[PDB]
Design a protein around this ligand. Structure first.
Ligand SMILES: Cc1cc2nc3c(=O)[nH]c(=O)nc-3n(C[C@H](O)[C@H](O)[C@H](O)COP(=O)(O)O)c2cc1C
Ligand SMILES: Cc1cc2nc3c(=O)[nH]c(=O)nc-3n(C[C@H](O)[C@H](O)[C@H](O)COP(=O)(O)O)c2cc1C
Lengths: 106, 105
């Protein structure tokens, strides 16, 4: 089952909602992640070029897919097939971002 | 500011999250809408053809936009500029639906 993260559009995209699969994949409870930027999932072996592409895509409210090395709460590394999309109203205003995580380590 | 509703993908798409704007527009607090299907927003003058188009789009996980008559908690009718899109993982699985509401009354 794939993880889902919903963030606010502005102010460095704090997490406002996660599904159960997010906790199964990452080992973090909703309480531990609400109000934080998702970058706590990253660690020393995370590819900086991948992080840079995410940073530019989110700043421009452009959809992006990346395979990124993340870390469970306990520090266990996993490969995250990550898809981020802006949520827009019909006037083009960005209301939120939605992220989908798949553990593709295996 | 535009409302947002997030639902589960299956089993009558219960609401799992709403933003602040949803409460401003509809008059409903999160606590009283979570676990409900968003159809409680509809009322006597809601166009049944519009509802049927939404039903078919959700069943097929197809994106759709409709201008639909909805009702605030206090019963005041408002025109909802509604856009629904599926949230998919890379293998095409539907993870959730996202709805965006604009009061265009
Ligand atoms: C909705 C959403 C979900 C995200 N999910 C993840 C994730 O699962 N793993 C991850 O490493 N980064 C994720 N990010 C990316 C980070 O939050 C951050 O945007 C990225 O690291 C680039 O910013 P930075 O260079 O300031 O860290 C997500 C971002 C958004 C907006
Ligand atoms: C994410 C999401 C958001 C929705 N938002 C609204 C809404 O704001 N107003 C509305 O009348 N119906 C909304 N709906 C549609 C109803 O929940 C329902 O799908 C529609 O009435 C058709 O199904 P039914 O014939 O079983 O009622 C939404 C559906 C989804 C999946």
């Amino acid at each position: 089952a794939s993880g889902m993260i919903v963030t606010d559009a502005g102010a460095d995209q704090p997490i406002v909602f996660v599904n159960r699969a997010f906790s199964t994949i990452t080992g973090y409870a909703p309480n531990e992640v609400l109000g934080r930027n998702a970058r706590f999932l990253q660690g020393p072996q995370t590819d900086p070029a991948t992080v840079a592409r995410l940073r530019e895509a989110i700043a421009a409210a452009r959809p992006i897919q990346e395979r990124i090395l993340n870390y469970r709460k306990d520090g266990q590394p996993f490969w995250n097939q990550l898809s981020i999309s802006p949520v827009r109203d019909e006037t083009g205003n960005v209301v939120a971002f939605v992220g989908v995580q798949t553990d593709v380590t295996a």
